[PDB]
Design an enzyme around this catalytic site. Sequence first.
Site, PDB file in Angstrom:
ATOM      1  N   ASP A   1       0.832  -1.203   0.000  1.00 34.64           N
ATOM      2  CA  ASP A   1       0.000   0.000   0.000  1.00 34.64           C
ATOM      3  C   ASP A   1       0.868   1.255   0.000  1.00 34.64           C
ATOM      4  O   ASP A   1       0.548   2.251   0.652  1.00 34.64           O
ATOM      5  CB  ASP A   1      -0.984  -0.013   1.176  1.00 34.64           C
ATOM      6  CG  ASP A   1      -2.199   0.893   0.960  1.00 34.64           C
ATOM      7  OD1 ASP A   1      -2.540   1.223  -0.202  1.00 34.64           O
ATOM      8  OD2 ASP A   1      -2.822   1.275   1.977  1.00 34.64           O
TER       9      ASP A   1
ATOM     10  N   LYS B   1       2.130   4.646  -1.079  1.00 35.93           N
ATOM     11  CA  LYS B   1       1.594   5.809  -1.774  1.00 35.93           C
ATOM     12  C   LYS B   1       1.891   7.031  -0.911  1.00 35.93           C
ATOM     13  O   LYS B   1       2.149   6.885   0.287  1.00 35.93           O
ATOM     14  CB  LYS B   1       0.082   5.666  -2.009  1.00 35.93           C
ATOM     15  CG  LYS B   1      -0.724   5.392  -0.753  1.00 35.93           C
ATOM     16  CD  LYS B   1      -2.170   5.133  -1.072  1.00 35.93           C
ATOM     17  CE  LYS B   1      -2.940   4.784   0.195  1.00 35.93           C
ATOM     18  NZ  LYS B   1      -4.382   4.609  -0.085  1.00 35.93           N
TER      19      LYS B   1
ATOM     20  N   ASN C   1       0.708   7.393   2.618  1.00 35.01           N
ATOM     21  CA  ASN C   1       1.272   6.491   3.618  1.00 35.01           C
ATOM     22  C   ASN C   1       2.743   6.770   3.915  1.00 35.01           C
ATOM     23  O   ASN C   1       3.406   5.950   4.562  1.00 35.01           O
ATOM     24  CB  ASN C   1       1.057   5.033   3.205  1.00 35.01           C
ATOM     25  CG  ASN C   1      -0.371   4.601   3.401  1.00 35.01           C
ATOM     26  OD1 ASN C   1      -1.106   5.233   4.163  1.00 35.01           O
ATOM     27  ND2 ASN C   1      -0.784   3.538   2.717  1.00 35.01           N
TER      28      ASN C   1
ATOM     29  N   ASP D   1       0.870   2.620   7.847  1.00 35.47           N
ATOM     30  CA  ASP D   1      -0.271   1.877   7.327  1.00 35.47           C
ATOM     31  C   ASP D   1       0.076   0.487   6.821  1.00 35.47           C
ATOM     32  O   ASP D   1       0.107   0.238   5.606  1.00 35.47           O
ATOM     33  CB  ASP D   1      -1.096   2.645   6.296  1.00 35.47           C
ATOM     34  CG  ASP D   1      -2.480   2.038   6.122  1.00 35.47           C
ATOM     35  OD1 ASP D   1      -2.653   0.854   6.483  1.00 35.47           O
ATOM     36  OD2 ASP D   1      -3.399   2.731   5.646  1.00 35.47           O
TER      37      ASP D   1
ATOM     38  N   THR E   1      -4.928   1.337  -3.868  1.00 31.24           N
ATOM     39  CA  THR E   1      -5.394   2.510  -4.603  1.00 31.24           C
ATOM     40  C   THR E   1      -4.995   2.393  -6.069  1.00 31.24           C
ATOM     41  O   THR E   1      -3.801   2.240  -6.357  1.00 31.24           O
ATOM     42  CB  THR E   1      -4.776   3.765  -3.997  1.00 31.24           C
ATOM     43  OG1 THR E   1      -5.214   3.896  -2.636  1.00 31.24           O
ATOM     44  CG2 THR E   1      -5.179   4.996  -4.775  1.00 31.24           C
TER      45      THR E   1
END
Length: 271
Positions: free
Chosen positions: A133, A135, A138, A155, A174
Amino acid sequence: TVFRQENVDDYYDTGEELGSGQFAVVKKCREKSTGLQYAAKFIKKRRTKSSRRGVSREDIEREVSILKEIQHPNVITLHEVYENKTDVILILELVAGGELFDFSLTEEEATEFLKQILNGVYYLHSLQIAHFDLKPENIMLLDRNVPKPRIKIIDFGLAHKIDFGNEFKNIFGTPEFVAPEIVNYEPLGLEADMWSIGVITYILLSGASPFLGDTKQETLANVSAVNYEFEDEYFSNTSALAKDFIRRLLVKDPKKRMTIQDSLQHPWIKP
Ligand SMILES: Oc1cc(O)cc(/C=C/c2ccc(O)cc2O)c1
């Protein structure tokens, strides 16, 4: 595995809200016994076996187990875990400088952040932990007011141990940041994080997202097709070696993509 079932409010006082998600809210807090400050992440539990709301206990325990393993300056650390009927509450390191997202950069400023991200991911991948995850949302800063802030990866809600080289699970991350193998529901490994770093690097240098379409399905279709290019309006004064770094990460075949060790030896990064 069971967690501390005393009332969290008997040991901490909460304050400003730091972040809010689909099944979790993060609140600044202060431990009563020490005066030390933390971030309390309240994760809503599933209330039935077959429900779609809340987070399954399996997923919560995997996140906690991964968080308990990590201790590195560029990754958030876990202090304590509480639970009650409604929530699991992670008491996490307080990272107060806000998102790298809320915070166009020069190549020195980009690489200064990027090197810290790579150091954090090198640590994780060394422990066979895929984050899944990565991005800008984060990637948080400790202090956003210094010329070169120190970053922390947060995260771990999608993170998995990769002890067989790959895992076969769906990762609903995402669209702008997920690798083609996620889009195509294929086996996943550490390589997916390296694609995400390529997307992050593209945004850091240009202020533009390489695969973003008008709808989620457009973005996912662009990712799977590797439909991106370096717009001269945004990249005209970016070095060819920076573009080379990105090009060797935004590669559809995970086996041909640069690894974390490759990225640290690449001439744009290697000192
Ligand atoms: O100090 C802060 C501020 C903030 O805005 C978020 C966090 C942590 C978020 C987070 C960390 C680990 C994890 O597994 C899940 C998470 O949501 C920590």
